[PDB]
Amino acid sequence: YRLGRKIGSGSFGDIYLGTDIAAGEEVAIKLECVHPQLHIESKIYKMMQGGVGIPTIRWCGAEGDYNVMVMELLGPSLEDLFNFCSRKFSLKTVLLLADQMISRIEYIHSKNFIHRDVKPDNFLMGLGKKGNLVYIIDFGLAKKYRDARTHQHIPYRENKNLTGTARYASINTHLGIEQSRRDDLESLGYVLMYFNLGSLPWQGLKAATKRQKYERISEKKMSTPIEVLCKGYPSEFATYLNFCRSLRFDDKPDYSYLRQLFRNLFHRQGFSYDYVFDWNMLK
Numbered sequence: 001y002r003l004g005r006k007i008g009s010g011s012f013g014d015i016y017l018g019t020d021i022a023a024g025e026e027v028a029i030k031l032e033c034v035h036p037q038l039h040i041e042s043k044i045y046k047m048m049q050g051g052v053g054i055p056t057i058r059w060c061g062a063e064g065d066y067n068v069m070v071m072e073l074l075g076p077s078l079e080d081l082f083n084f085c086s087r088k089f090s091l092k093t094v095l096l097l098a099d100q101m102i103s104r105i106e107y108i109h110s111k112n113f114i115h116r117d118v119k120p121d122n123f124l125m126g127l128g129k130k131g132n133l134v135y136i137i138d139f140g141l142a143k144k145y146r147d148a149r150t151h152q153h154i155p156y157r158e159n160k161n162l163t164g165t166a167r168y169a170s171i172n173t174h175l176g177i178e179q180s181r182r183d184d185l186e187s188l189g190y191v192l193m194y195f196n197l198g199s200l201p202w203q204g205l206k207a208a209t210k211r212q213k214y215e216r217i218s219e220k221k222m223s224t225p226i227e228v229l230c231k232g233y234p235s236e237f238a239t240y241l242n243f244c245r246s247l248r249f250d251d252k253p254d255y256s257y258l259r260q261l262f263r264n265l266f267h268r269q270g271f272s273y274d275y276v277f278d279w280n281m282l283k
């Protein structure tokens with residue numbers, strides 16, 4: 001593997017572009033200085049392997065002063081594509097995205113884990129034949145939510161300090177409640193509305209401590225009724241967020257219902273099933 005330039009930073013470590021030298025294929029290479037977390041993330045990926053929209057790990061090991069995890073190269077993140085599309089996606093694109101994202105999250109849940117860091121940066125489009133598939137990345141904050149053998153849900157816990165990115169965190173996460181399935185989905189809800197509006201009402205709030213800033217975000221989040229947040233947009237978005245906040249800590253979300261909400265809306269809007277995203281029209 002030839003090592004390349006730094007293209008990003010995950011919940012842990014830094015990712016670089018690279019090359020499978022003998023196959024002449026470009027790859028993504030995540031490095032962790034040899035508190036270790038890379039191997040754990042690698043195990044989760046392997047456990048998720050074989051699912052739709054999940055990256056393939058090509059190699060895992062240590063070289064020098066680094067633990068290394070080579071992954072198949074993917075396309076731009078949804079945050080990147082959002083930028084390229086002038087930071088506003090058309091309703092059809094949000095719906096096409098929502099259908100796949102609910103599904104990715106549902107799959108991770110079917111495998112007994114919660115992601116805990118659902119945000120535009122952690123969703124990347126594929127390449128080649130899978131150019132229209134939305135992948136989910138970075139399991140650096142993922143956690144098991146039910147025992148593999150018995151499916152006993154983890155217990156309810158309070159006073160937890162925040163983990164994930166504040167902009168898309170659920171109201172309960174801000175309130176120190178252990179995250180569960182409902183939270184990955186509520187976060188997706190804010191992500192969708194972010195795509196619709198171009199920004200969220202609790203963005204760009206200035207504070208001192210960089211811990212007092214989460215407080216402002218929390219208060220704003222609890223001070224902004226859902227109907228206001230989604231005012232001027234299809235009621236489905238508000239219905240989706242309300243459903244998410246109504247989920248009991250250990251409830252199994254009805255993913256099908258949520259997708260159907262957006263599918264019916266798609267049908268009613270009269271959009272064509274050609275799967276053409278906004279970025280597919282850049283010339």
Ligand SMILES: COc1cnc(COc2ccc(F)c(F)c2)cc1-c1cc2c([nH]1)CCNC2=O
Pocket residue numbers: 007008009010011015017028030055071072073074075121137138139
């Ligand atoms: C399977 O994981 C990946 C596969 N392919 C790419 C290609 O990314 C680029 C290609 C060309 C560019 F010019 C560029 F800027 C980025 C990136 C990743 C990736 C993994 C992680 C991140 N990114 C940021 C957050 N934490 C992560 O664990």
